[PDB]
Subunit: 159 residues, 8 copies
């Protein structure tokens, strides 16, 4: 039973969105991953968003670039938390993606993370933290993961 | 009269910007409808509006939005009428967010984007008229006459006194 | 027992952050609100973040502008979800605030919302949606609220 | 065949971008002409091209330019055909200069602006078709069919395997 | 006999362009000032540019904002030096004006000055410097003006 | 006797500034080219600017990137027209170069041209146009050059 | 004997630059304040920078806006640390000022602080910190000031 | 005994930060270099900043990119001067890094230098200049280095 849905408008977004999925796998959180396009499959996008809650999802992670409407339009159609990953665009380096996603109007939040792969990693982590607010074992796994990275960084600290 | 142009915007506060497009349509006697349709607050209604636009006899839609300005692009995803997007000047980023959100549409879903704010809104009305004028000679002729009068006005007021 | 902490670096951020608090009040979600500064009270900020989970908080909303470090540093110190509100800054209109908050490196997410008051409203709603993923009554409230706004916009 | 769309650009190096618009027109069987017309290097020729476009039977002009991208706007000042402006990605500023130079046209002279680069160029072709499709049903129907096929393609390739 | 033409697309540009004209007056350089619009009077603009040289002008100062095409299109139609003043626009504060003017392609220079009133002052000064490269008295007037400002600034220097 | 000085802060700017020099060569305008740095040779830069007029120069072309001060500081030290070429910088793609050059305060104009090689070409042409305002033969050359390019573009 | 020089190109920059001075006054660090313009008094600017060290200054704080060359050109002429305050410009809100100051090439550092009044305050504090690296009492005064602010923010 | 600490959040920043170190080596200023991450080792970062003064450091050079909090958070925890190097980030080319570092609020200065390698070089030179305010020999070494560069640029 998937707890997180990871969606993106194009197969070319996968290069970015795989990082989020890697985190969910590392933390043993069941998820689904789909191509859902705001612009090329708008009706399907509404159906996906609409039914997410009934289907058992708790969080949706959505990636898009350019005029990046997928996270916001999904967010308009569900009251699950929606995390938006700005995919790095070719001309404007994800500045268009970022502003298109983060600047949502009052009433329809999108939890926006960094442009590109760091954000995608962070979307996975943030989905986990959301689950971890009620699942202690996920919270504990997040703490352990962070503690291991801290130790790794600090003990390789000399240059 | 059957509307040829739909002028829509996500919020009543956008009207201060969008009224300029309507003024142009009025000046050129182009029948139109104006509605508040919000991508984010009335998403199902937005799809219904877009979906049915062609059946309803509309030829062009002008859509205004600011910030994460998704109204024009999502309407455009749902109709093959030409969709003209007016970036409303946002408070923090002065319509830069509005502009990039509207203009940077992916291959397959064009939005005809005009200038941020009131100049763009005027121009949305004129562009809707130009679209119509590609098959309505009288609208094309009116546009020419309008432009010619402005040219004369400017060139004959050309001394700075 | 507070479920949400709403924090900001300066009392001058309250004009922006009150909007998040108004949403929490509307939805009857218990919360606490504090001035916690990354730069002027850095130790206190660590202690706040560190103990949030023990204290029963589920989500933190943090507002900051300029070189806006509060949300990210709090997120570095807790695995509670942290929502960052970029406060509109004077010179650069919140662009500095936004980039300072959203561009967090892998490992330390901050859920970033829009620059200014719209973002603040949305931080309250997003905190609620986080709660609502497990509390059905909060979820149903969010759905009802949204449906009433849809009707109001469509009809009038 | 009588051209319905003129596709112009200031430099042969812009063709790498502009060819996408032409590809769309070809796919939809819309007759068109393509010319190098430079605002800055052939200014008189640009005016002549714009001026005569309507007489010559064109209904829409697609114009690409980068940097200080004046071609679309100056063509638009000289015709009341709809003019679609494609911002070509510039070397230093990645088409930000191109975009602002094109989209920020003053009241009176709209330019239908699309995305920077190749996505915009594709979209210029589609938008020219949508303009035509407002009075040519078959072009409108083709656009619908095209969009419907893409929708099916995307939704049925929707699992990431 | 005017030596400099000062042109702008709109009467609302005058608030900016008057600074250039004030300098020309201060330096006793004869000039003309006209509204010439790239977008609303395109043919007139070409005629103005075309005939400038025959008419005895040596430099044109052109102001425009937004999608600011007047300086560049004038420059495409004459080989007089053309100085472009980016007028501060409402939404983007003259960033559009600046890029529209300065980013000319190889073959058609526009001498671009600062956004707004400082640039307009500077357009007047730059037109004078261009004349001053061959008229010694104008060069000497520029030196004297600059020397007086230097003395003024330095001697009011304590705060 | 040089009529134009073409200067730049670093030898790495030559890749950009050679384009201006190519135009001057094409038009047979005598010029000198030098490395003159606002930041590494500030005194020399003042001396260069100061003496330009005595030395018979009529126009200076100056290229610089990043915090691009060369054109403005030279312009502060001469009433010759100074043309500033923003060199494309690594991180910010000449945006810093452009703003550093064009945004001169009242009193000290710099004639700014496009970022990079197009601007450099244009600095040469603009220097020539300045000369051509009084030398008819240079003006006529510029007209002929432009007419040949028009024909080439329109026909082929 | 002044330890810090606070300079700016225009009297209109004083509104911004006073904040730095207020900090120096608060900490009892002797300073001088002068209008020194890179573009309108270039020779004077070189003389000021050149003689700073001989005159007993340890740090220079320089404010400028737009094409903001003052800090960098002073820094090219002294090896005292130079702190640059980007003054908020009218059109571009200090983005020009910031890029013009901070993007200095290898060899000529400028210590750049925030756009506007916050930056100016911080230029004063940074000058003090530099002095405080060798003057214990200045360092201790900085710690006390920061501690008092911490307490004020955390408690009220 | 190290006089300067050079720190960065990630080993991948070393490519940039080495330039600062090379300058310190050239000038024979003892320094230490460490990975200290604001977001991945926040407690360690506080301990490093807190103890810097007791440990004998006079200046800290800190590099960070993206949401670049390291310099500012270290600066919140010490009254040593802290120099911030904006590391060039992938998407936004260090614009995020720059705004995240330079826009510090009143009370907590960071001395910000250019984006990337030029900035890093300059952080080393600026640290030296700070020391050179009280160490004549460092000051003199800075003058000699600058004079040699001047000669090299002017002559060849």
């Amino acid at each position: 039973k998937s707890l997180v849905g990871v969606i993106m408008g194009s197969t070319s977004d996968w290069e970015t969105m795989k990082y989020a999925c890697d985190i969910l796998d590392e933390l043993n959180i069941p998820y689904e991953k789909k191509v859902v396009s705001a612009h090329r499959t708008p009706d399907y996008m509404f159906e996906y968003a609409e039914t997410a809650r009934e289907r058992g999802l708790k969080v949706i992670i959505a990636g898009a670039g350019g005029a990046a409407h997928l996270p916001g339009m999904v967010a308009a159609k569900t009251n699950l938390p929606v995390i938006g990953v700005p995919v790095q665009s070719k001309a404007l380096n994800g500045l268009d993606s970022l502003l298109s996603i983060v600047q949502m109007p009052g009433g329809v939040p999108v939890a926006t993370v960094a442009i590109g792969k760091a954000g995608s990693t962070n979307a996975g982590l943030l989905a986990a933290q959301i689950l971890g607010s009620f699942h202690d074992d996920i919270h504990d796994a997040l703490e352990l993961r962070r503690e291991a990275i801290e130790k790794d960084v600090r003990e390789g600290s000399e240059l």
